[PDB]
């Protein structure tokens, strides 16, 4: 029933926290999102919004997170809307990366973003998956790093 | 039924990490608190608890988190215990309180509080509310700059 | 159902947070855990896994915690899978620990562990408990101060 939904959405930020934090970019996304997928990182990058393939995003991913020794996402406060087939999920995320000693040399080596999710969900014919992830940083230490 | 009353119990806990993470100390507050609400921040502040209403709780916040550029609340380890239209809920959390630049100058800028809350909720006609807070802090860092 | 039990064995983790955070090892780990426990924590200490009285664990973290002036440990991202009266969980895990001044002196005092618990559970006649804890680090910080 609707129980069983949200706690299979909320289930979902722990397998997506997975995906980066155990760099496992392909299978995963595959039990986690839908393909494509919408994407809206602006907050952080400045890239606008897109709809891309999902083994695009999942190269993506690999690419920019192994520019890390290790990442953790902590994603807590979870507030689930569900339509029949449709969620909206609002959460909260603390997310740590950091960069290996042969990059940070004497200086400071985690970049950290704090903020939220604002996303979207769909029950698929394999079960409710990620449709569309925006995250919205209310603040960030070190994103310099993310560029170095 | 008894697990949809925990679920939104839970996810109270989200709204009420929004209300200061996302500044927003004038609507959602009636979202979240019963009016009045009791508060204990004792463990942190040294005010004893008092029952205040739900404006003068807001009008303190918005005071109070306006010295912060950024704050960020992970509350996790949810333990409910329901008595229908009541409940008790013990949980961690780890709240992180930025100071800007102007203030912060060479030395450290992030106030950080970790302990639990042990709070109750009440069911009332618009949804379960949390209509006491308490705070206990196991551990703070750089709990001078919460006065600075 | 299937859906308490769920909630059940998430709330499992805020006590097993409890007991550490707390201090408490002597009731709450009974709540927590079943007698005997397997443990390991070889990601981060080297001692392979092993099945231990729960009497036995409690005396242990009692010794070690005892250490460390305050914990905090954030778990988030639960992913449980049931089958009738056992459970495996994937959880994520950032765990804190304080050291005192006195040991601390003028250098670093936080010990952090990032990584994921791959615990299992078993339904007790007295309720859901842990009877497997696994922890596998991402990453360490000061891992040396566990040592000093």
Redesign the interface.
């Known amino acids: 029933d ?3 939904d ?2 299979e959405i909320i ?1 979902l ?3 997506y ?2 995906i980066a ?2 760099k496992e970019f392909t299978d995963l996304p595959r039990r986690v999102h839908t393909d494509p997928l919408t994407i809206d990182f602006e907050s952080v990058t400045g890239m606008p919004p897109m709809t891309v393939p999902l083994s695009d995003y999942g190269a993506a991913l690999r690419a920019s997170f192994g520019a890390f ?12 809307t569900i339509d029949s087939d449709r969620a909206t999920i ?3 995320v ?1 997310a ?1 990366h ?1 960069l290996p000693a042969e990059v940070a040399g004497d200086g400071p080596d985690r970049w950290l973003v ?3 999710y604002d996303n979207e969900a769909v029950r698929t014919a394999d079960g409710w998956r990620l449709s569309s992830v925006k995250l919205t940083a ?2 960030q230490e070190n994103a310099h790093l993310a560029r170095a």
Chains 1, 2, 3 share one sequence.
């Open positions: 609707a129980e069983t949200r706690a289930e930020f722990g397998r926290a997975d934090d155990l020794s290790a990442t953790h996402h902590a994603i807590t406060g979870h507030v689930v609002h959460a909260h603390r740590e950091w704090v903020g939220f209310s603040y």
